[PDB]
Amino acid sequence: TNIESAPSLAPMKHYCDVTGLPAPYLDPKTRLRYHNKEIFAMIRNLPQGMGEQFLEARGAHTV
Amino acid sequence: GLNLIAAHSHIRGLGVDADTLEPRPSSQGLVGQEKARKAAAVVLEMIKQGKIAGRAVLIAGPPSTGKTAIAMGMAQSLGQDVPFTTLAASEIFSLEMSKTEALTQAFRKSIGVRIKEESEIMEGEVVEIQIDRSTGGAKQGKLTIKTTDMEAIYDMGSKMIDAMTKERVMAGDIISIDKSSGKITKLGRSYARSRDYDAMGVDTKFLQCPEGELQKRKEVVHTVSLHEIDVINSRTQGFLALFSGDTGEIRSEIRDQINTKVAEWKEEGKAEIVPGVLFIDEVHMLDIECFSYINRALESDLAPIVIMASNRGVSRIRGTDYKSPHGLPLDFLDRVVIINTHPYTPDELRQILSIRAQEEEVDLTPDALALLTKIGQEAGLRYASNLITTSQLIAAKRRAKQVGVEDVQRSFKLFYDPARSVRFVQESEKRLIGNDGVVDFSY
Numbered sequence: 387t388n389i390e391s392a393p394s395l396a397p398m399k400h401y402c403d404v405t406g407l408p409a410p411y412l413d414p415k416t417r418l419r420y421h422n423k424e425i426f427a428m429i430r431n432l433p434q435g436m437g438e439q440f441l442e443a444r445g446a447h448t449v
Numbered sequence: 450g451l452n453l454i455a456a457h458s459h460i461r462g463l464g465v466d467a468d469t470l471e472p473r474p475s476s477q478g479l480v481g482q483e484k485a486r487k488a489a490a491v492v493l494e495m496i497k498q499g500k501i502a503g504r505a506v507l508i509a510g511p512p513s514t515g516k517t518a519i520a521m522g523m524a525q526s527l528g529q530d531v532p533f534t535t536l537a538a539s540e541i542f543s544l545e546m547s548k549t550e551a552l553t554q555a556f557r558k559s560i561g562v563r564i565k566e567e568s569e570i571m572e573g574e575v576v577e578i579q580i581d582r583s584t585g586g587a588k589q590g591k592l593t594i595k596t597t598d599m600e601a602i603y604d605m606g607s608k609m610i611d612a613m614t615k616e617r618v619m620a621g622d623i624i625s626i627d628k629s630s631g632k633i634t635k636l637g638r639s640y641a642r643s644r645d646y647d648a649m650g651v652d653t654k655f656l657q658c659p660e661g662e663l664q665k666r667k668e669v670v671h672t673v674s675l676h677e678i679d680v681i682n683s684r685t686q687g688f689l690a691l692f693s694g695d696t697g698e699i700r701s702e703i704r705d706q707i708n709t710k711v712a713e714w715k716e717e718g719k720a721e722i723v724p725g726v727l728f729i730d731e732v733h734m735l736d737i738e739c740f741s742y743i744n745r746a747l748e749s750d751l752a753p754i755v756i757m758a759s760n761r762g763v764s765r766i767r768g769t770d771y772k773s774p775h776g777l778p779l780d781f782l783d784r785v786v787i788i789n790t791h792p793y794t795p796d797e798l799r800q801i802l803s804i805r806a807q808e809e810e811v812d813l814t815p816d817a818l819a820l821l822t823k824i825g826q827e828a829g830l831r832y833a834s835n836l837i838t839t840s841q842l843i844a845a846k847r848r849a850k851q852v853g854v855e856d857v858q859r860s861f862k863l864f865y866d867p868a869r870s871v872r873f874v875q876e877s878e879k880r881l882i883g884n885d886g887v888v889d890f891s892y
């Protein structure tokens with residue numbers, strides 16, 4: 387039939403977009419998920435285009 | 450503050466060399482009483498060491514010889530690490546409970562259960578709160594929080610949105626959230642948002658934003674007494690009786706169950722047991738029924754060390770009609786070692802008066818200190834210590850910057866010592882009401 391799966395209804399776990407470690411925090415500015423203040427420090431001073439790449443690694447985008 | 454200057458306020462500890470238990474001639478506010486301070490330090494060591502259970506120590510000596518001061522010095526040199534219960538023996542004559550029950554509760558208060566636990570606490574400044582309240586309420590909402598090091602946004606579950614609205618949490622508020630309970634404490638208002646707080650009056654304080662991670666595990670080390678566990682288990686709000694009183698006589702089978710459970714927690718390693726001290730001030734106010742209970746209460750494994758002070762000589766035991774040393778029955782005195790306090794020498798009185806003149810904001814001229822020392826020898830340490838306050842108040846009436854002999858002389862003249870008070874009584878026996886009820890009111 388070639389139509390053959392559906393999304394899960396379970397809530398997904400949250401991982402840091404940078405280091406992949408678990409992420410308690412979601413940055414409201416760039417919407418990257420991050421592990422700790424050390425990674426937040428690099429996120430907020432990323433080269434301007436890089437934020438969309440960390441999203442795109444999980445298929446997320448601003449648009 | 451709310452602590453005023455009081456008779457023991459100068460006692461900061463026991464004044465003993467911790468490396469050797471050698472008492473220093475003076476330190477930490479204790480003067481002399483060296484052998485008694487050494488013995489109290491040996492008791493202090495085995496209190497901290499915990500391995501020894503249910504020993505009773507009596508401190509015996511004339512009034513004003515530092516018995517309470519040594520008791521206060523031990524309490525100050527144990528601190529929070531060990532439960533310290535102070536009981537005036539007058540206190541157990543309750544109308545709510547029998548005196549052996551009151552005396553049981555005092556022993557139970559003196560053993561701590563130390564329980565070590567963690568929680569994740571989230572703390573920071575609220576950047577904003579959105580709650581839709583979509584008729585209806587608490588449907589959905591987002592929370593932004595920052596420290597100085599991080600900012601994060603959270604979707605809130607509905608029972609958290611109730612908590613936020615219950616605490617009227619607002620942009621700029623510095624909050625802690627305990628996650629597992631979900632209680633919110635507003636630690637303060639952030640200074641940067643001060644302009645927003647138009648309803649807050651100018652008396653309002655403000656704070657700097659928190660620092661570090663928004664979330665961390667903070668470990669709390671609770672210590673809860675056996676008495677508190679006993680009272681908690683009495684009724685559906687048993688703890689509420691830990692404040693108002695109105696505990697009954699707690700049933701023995703409740704205590705016996707709790708002792709078994711606390712032995713389980715110890716063996717399971719979930720809790721430590723922390724033996725404290727019960728200090729019974731003026732233990733001779735107890736009666737013969739009390740001493741009989743104490744004798745076997747001390748044989749319990751979960752007994753504190755009991756420390757006791759008595760003024761009394763060979764004196765009538767209460768609740769009977771015969772006399773014994775300290776007013777304590779010999780069968781009880783068989784279970785007790787005794788520390789003696791001696792009277793002070795004139796230089797020790799001078800030093801105690803000096804210390805008391807440091808704790809009170811008083812300047813004594815050297816001749817005023819010499820006169821108070823002489824008065825202390827003649828009229829007792831306590832009376833000369835009460836002349837210190839009196840002399841400062843008289844000096845301030847004459848606007849003097851230092852207390853002079855004139856002020857001490859006015860004090861001695863205005864306020865009688867016990868001996869002159871007795872002599873006044875022994876002269877006024879016709880004007881004072883006698884033990885016969887007889888009195889003459891005529892001139």
Ligand SMILES: Nc1ncnc2c1ncn2[C@@H]1O[C@H](COP(=O)(O)OP(=O)(O)O)[C@@H](O)[C@H]1O
Nearest residue numbers: 456457478479480482512513514515516517518
């Ligand atoms: N050795 C001492 N060092 C410092 N202050 C003392 C000393 N002995 C007694 N005092 C103080 O003098 C007063 C009387 O002593 P206190 O300990 O109350 O005697 P008692 O308890 O035997 O009546 C208290 O204010 C106490 O703090």
